């Protein structure tokens, strides 16, 4: 039984994990904690750049937008290096997404505009979604701290995977803009170890990570089978247990991810 494979992950692992991938036509949903509450980390990225590409037209996308080292909080690798040139909408959801870049989200928070830096407009969106379950609270920080418990910046597997399921393959977006998410989300640079190292390689994945404190670790992506169906896999882990300095596992995703693999499959 899958639930019993989860389990040992969690055992084997020292983890609390969640999975929930959406049922099908084809297939059952798979649901495991899938209602209980984790750290987005930087998965809310993806649906921040929907909610960038929903509130605008794509000529917003060359949008250039300025800002100084003192708006660099987070790990940033795209944004560190154009502090002088500044970096247009387009980049800097391309960086959000492939690169996690911090300062580029916060950017695009502060596009939508609105109180919390951006963080409302997000939960907005989110909200108008019909998810009335996740939330963010805070723009990214390195100084952030997010304790266990803390209801602020979380949202659950099951929430998430359904707003990844309407984003990029349901009507959510137009064509055009749905395009450019999966794109961007295709050619994510961060998520080799994660879902893509759970599912075969004649399998397309396209994906965003989170990480953090308290041995975060989540993933949330969408896969189509050689066969031609897609679905949704959103994987959340913590390891709380082992206080702030627990360590991340991304194989805990990769294994939880080849659980997944091998039933839809």
Known sequence: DLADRFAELERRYDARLGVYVPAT??????????????????????????????????????????????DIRSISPVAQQHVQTGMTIGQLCDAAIRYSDGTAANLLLADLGGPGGGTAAFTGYLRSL??????????????????????????????????????????????????????????????????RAGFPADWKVIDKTGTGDYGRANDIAVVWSPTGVPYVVAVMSDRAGGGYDAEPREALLAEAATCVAGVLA
């Not at 930087?42 to 003192?70: C, E, G, M, R, W």
């Not at 099951?158 to 989300?185: C, E, F, S, Y």
Request: hydrophobic share 40%; with cysteine; glycine share 4%.
């Open 25 to 70: 036509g084809t297939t059952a949903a798979i649901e495991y904690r899938a209602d209980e509450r984790f750290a987005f980390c930087s998965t809310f990225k993806a649906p921040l750049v929907a909610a960038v590409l929903h509130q605008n037209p794509l000529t917003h996308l060359d949008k250039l937008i300025t800002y100084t080292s003192d």
């Open 130 to 195: 019909g998810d009335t379950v996740s939330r963010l609270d805070a723009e990214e920080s390195e100084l952030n701290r997010d304790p266990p418990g803390d209801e602020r910046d979380t949202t659950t597997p099951h929430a998430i995977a359904l707003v990844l399921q309407q984003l990029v393959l349901g009507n959510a977006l137009p064509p055009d803009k749905r395009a450019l998410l999966t794109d961007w989300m295709a050619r994510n640079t961060t998520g080799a170890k994660r879902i």
